[PDB]
Design an enzyme around this catalytic site. Structure first.
Site, PDB file in Angstrom:
ATOM      1  N   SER A 202     -37.603 -77.156 -35.465  1.00 58.04           N
ATOM      2  CA  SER A 202     -38.315 -77.569 -36.685  1.00 58.04           C
ATOM      3  C   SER A 202     -37.453 -78.105 -37.824  1.00 58.04           C
ATOM      4  O   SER A 202     -37.955 -78.380 -38.911  1.00 58.04           O
ATOM      5  CB  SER A 202     -39.124 -76.410 -37.241  1.00 58.04           C
ATOM      6  OG  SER A 202     -40.129 -75.862 -36.429  1.00 58.04           O
TER       7      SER A 202
ATOM      8  N   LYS B  17     -38.161 -81.715 -38.498  1.00 63.74           N
ATOM      9  CA  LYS B  17     -39.288 -82.044 -39.366  1.00 63.74           C
ATOM     10  C   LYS B  17     -38.827 -82.674 -40.679  1.00 63.74           C
ATOM     11  O   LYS B  17     -39.596 -83.359 -41.354  1.00 63.74           O
ATOM     12  CB  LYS B  17     -40.126 -80.792 -39.638  1.00 63.74           C
ATOM     13  CG  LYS B  17     -41.025 -80.400 -38.476  1.00 63.74           C
ATOM     14  CD  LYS B  17     -41.693 -79.057 -38.704  1.00 63.74           C
ATOM     15  CE  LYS B  17     -42.637 -78.700 -37.561  1.00 63.74           C
ATOM     16  NZ  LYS B  17     -42.829 -77.233 -37.449  1.00 63.74           N
TER      17      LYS B  17
ATOM     18  N   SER C 215     -43.825 -75.268 -42.150  1.00 63.16           N
ATOM     19  CA  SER C 215     -43.450 -75.596 -40.757  1.00 63.16           C
ATOM     20  C   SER C 215     -44.673 -75.868 -39.870  1.00 63.16           C
ATOM     21  O   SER C 215     -44.693 -75.502 -38.714  1.00 63.16           O
ATOM     22  CB  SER C 215     -42.503 -74.568 -40.126  1.00 63.16           C
ATOM     23  OG  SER C 215     -41.574 -75.156 -39.356  1.00 63.16           O
TER      24      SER C 215
ATOM     25  N   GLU D 245     -44.762 -82.018 -31.157  1.00 67.57           N
ATOM     26  CA  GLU D 245     -44.963 -80.581 -31.118  1.00 67.57           C
ATOM     27  C   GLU D 245     -45.997 -80.256 -30.055  1.00 67.57           C
ATOM     28  O   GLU D 245     -46.896 -81.052 -29.793  1.00 67.57           O
ATOM     29  CB  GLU D 245     -45.446 -80.065 -32.470  1.00 67.57           C
ATOM     30  CG  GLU D 245     -44.483 -80.291 -33.620  1.00 67.57           C
ATOM     31  CD  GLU D 245     -43.213 -79.474 -33.493  1.00 67.57           C
ATOM     32  OE1 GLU D 245     -43.096 -78.700 -32.520  1.00 67.57           O
ATOM     33  OE2 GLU D 245     -42.333 -79.604 -34.370  1.00 67.57           O
TER      34      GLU D 245
ATOM     35  N   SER E 267     -36.591 -72.774 -35.149  1.00 67.91           N
ATOM     36  CA  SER E 267     -36.355 -71.808 -34.091  1.00 67.91           C
ATOM     37  C   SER E 267     -37.087 -72.379 -32.890  1.00 67.91           C
ATOM     38  O   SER E 267     -37.971 -73.222 -33.034  1.00 67.91           O
ATOM     39  CB  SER E 267     -36.875 -70.403 -34.385  1.00 67.91           C
ATOM     40  OG  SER E 267     -38.264 -70.418 -34.644  1.00 67.91           O
TER      41      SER E 267
END
Length: 260
Positions: free
Chosen positions: A42, A45, A102, A138, A209
């Site tokens: 992430s 992002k 997130s 994702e 993570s």
């Protein structure tokens, strides 16, 4: 000696540690496995939001454009996106959701909008980043399988690029301060890099993570009496179902900034 504390930490964690600090004061560096590729998770992002900010430079109306959020859009983790099912979310709202909370749905909306994962890589390239590569969306971009180069970058490629986005020439001022405002307002970096730093220091960060116990955090730091520091702590482990280790990022941050 700093090399010795980060090698001890890594060995005991039973994982592979990466670290790339850039003290802007004099542009000095502290590198540990900084030219080795880690799965961004992430942390990627940040590049998707900055690619949408870079757009707003040429399109003043862009960020206010609304985006229809539906059920079949919702991926696995949608802390903000789910509230807006059957509603809308402007592009600025999805950049803030992806970074501060997130949200994966948000990350996916931004990508689609751009045209796919390969556009966000082309953007990284235009910033002078030749290492970054976003391949998937994702939630699959977090598999973090060892050796897999997909959706990976290096700790130094990410430190240099983050510095340019938040303290450099990557973005026009307005967009730079919006990227920075977004990062600071992050709600997920508590136990990570922030933990290993003084409570008084200011920090805008984005965690990442994933599987194989992948635990990442990239943060821009503003000491109370010094120039900014750019810190990228990437960590990953050999076992797919390994626990995530934020306490390792808090430790490493402490070890490297032990001197400011």
């Amino acid at each position: 000696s700093v090399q010795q504390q980060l090698e001890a930490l890594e060995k005991s964690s039973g994982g592979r540690l990466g670290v790339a600090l850039i003290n802007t004061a004099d542009n000095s560096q502290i590198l540990y496995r900084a030219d080795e590729r880690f799965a961004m998770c992430s942390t990627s992002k940040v590049m998707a939001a900055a690619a949408v900010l870079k757009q707003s430079e040429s399109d003043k109306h862009l960020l206010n454009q609304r985006v229809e959020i539906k059920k079949s859009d919702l991926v696995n983790y949608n802390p903000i996106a789910e509230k807006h099912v059957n509603g809308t979310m402007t592009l600025a709202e999805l950049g803030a959701a992806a970074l501060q909370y997130s949200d994966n749905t948000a990350m996916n909306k931004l990508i689609a909008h751009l045209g796919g994962p390969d556009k966000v890589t082309a953007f990284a390239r235009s910033l002078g980043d030749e290492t970054f590569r976003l391949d998937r969306t994702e939630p699959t971009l977090n598999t973090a399988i060892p050796g897999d180069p997909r959706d990976t970058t290096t700790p130094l490629a990410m430190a240099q690029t983050l510095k340019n986005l938040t303290l450099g020439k990557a973005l026009a001022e307005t967009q730079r301060a919006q990227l920075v405002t977004w990062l600071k307002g992050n709600t997920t970096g508590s136990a990570s890099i922030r933990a290993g730093l003084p409570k008084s220091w200011v920090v805008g960060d984005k965690t990442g993570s994933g599987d194989y116990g992948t635990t990442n955090d990239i943060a821009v730091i503003w000491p109370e009496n010094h120039a900014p520091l750019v810190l990228v702590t990437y960590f990953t482990q050999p076992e797919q179902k390994a626990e995530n280790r934020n306490d390792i990022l808090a430790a490493a941050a402490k070890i490297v900034t032990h001197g400011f």
